[PDB]
């Protein structure tokens, strides 16, 4: 139940760790002691800076969130820097291992799991009042390559200290991830296809025909409109379809053949959700 603050290592991270001066694109470096691999993690010492890790430090525990190993303060070409020390992450981003199957065959169950892996992490931070709020696909980066790979939600860049609300975009974005893993395409309003036409009914059939109203319906309460009535974390995990995920039928998704049909759009994808969370925020 007691859990140690945060210790910034004041002494050259060099030290510690073969990083051999080619140091904020992110690095792989070794500790020294140990040989093992790490990531880092170079920021502008800033009392910005220092709240984010603060905040980062008080849930690296999560299991479902890229932990940090050392904080270093120190300096580079005499700017003041916070060196962020934290474990690999090799797996690539969520959607992008799942666009490259070769097979293109994604279930309802596999996108159930998901969920609960992010719903998780959420789940931690919320209950130590503390709002993510940039919960977007480039946050969510698997351990290793594998098959059997881990989860992790990262950039705490837009997270703070929550004594209501603030809660409430980070379930909107678990309304939009679950929606884009369900189909391919997010639930926004040439040479490709429309996917929701303007104004439209929220899930078209070509890919949401097989998608159960219990499923519908779980998502059009993340995605309200009105915060006051916006599913929240404690009901988004009691949800059997989360709490249950080896219960939830294989439905065969669009998901894989969609992502990579659409993958032009990608970048506009992420960037009308990111436009679309500072508003939200
Ligand atoms: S920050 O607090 O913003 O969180 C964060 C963390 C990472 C992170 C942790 C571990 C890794 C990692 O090891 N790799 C692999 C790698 C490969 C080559 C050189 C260095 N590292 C990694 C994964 C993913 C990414 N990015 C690239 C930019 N788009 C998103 C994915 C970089 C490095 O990374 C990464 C990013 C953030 Cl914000």
Redesign the pocket.
Known sequence: MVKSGLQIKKNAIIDDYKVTSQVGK???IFNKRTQEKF?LKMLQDCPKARREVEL?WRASQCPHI?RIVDVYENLYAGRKCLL?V?????GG?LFSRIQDRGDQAFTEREASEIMKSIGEAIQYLHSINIAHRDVKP?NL?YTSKRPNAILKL????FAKETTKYDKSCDMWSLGVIMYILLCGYPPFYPGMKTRIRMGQYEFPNPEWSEVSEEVKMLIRNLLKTEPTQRMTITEFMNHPWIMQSTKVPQTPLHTSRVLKEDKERWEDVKEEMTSALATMR
Do not use: P, R, S, W
Request: proline fraction near 0%; hydrophobic fraction near 45%.
């Open positions: 992110v690095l792989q990531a980062h890229v962020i934290m474990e690999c992450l090799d981003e480039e980066l990262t950039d705490f860049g």
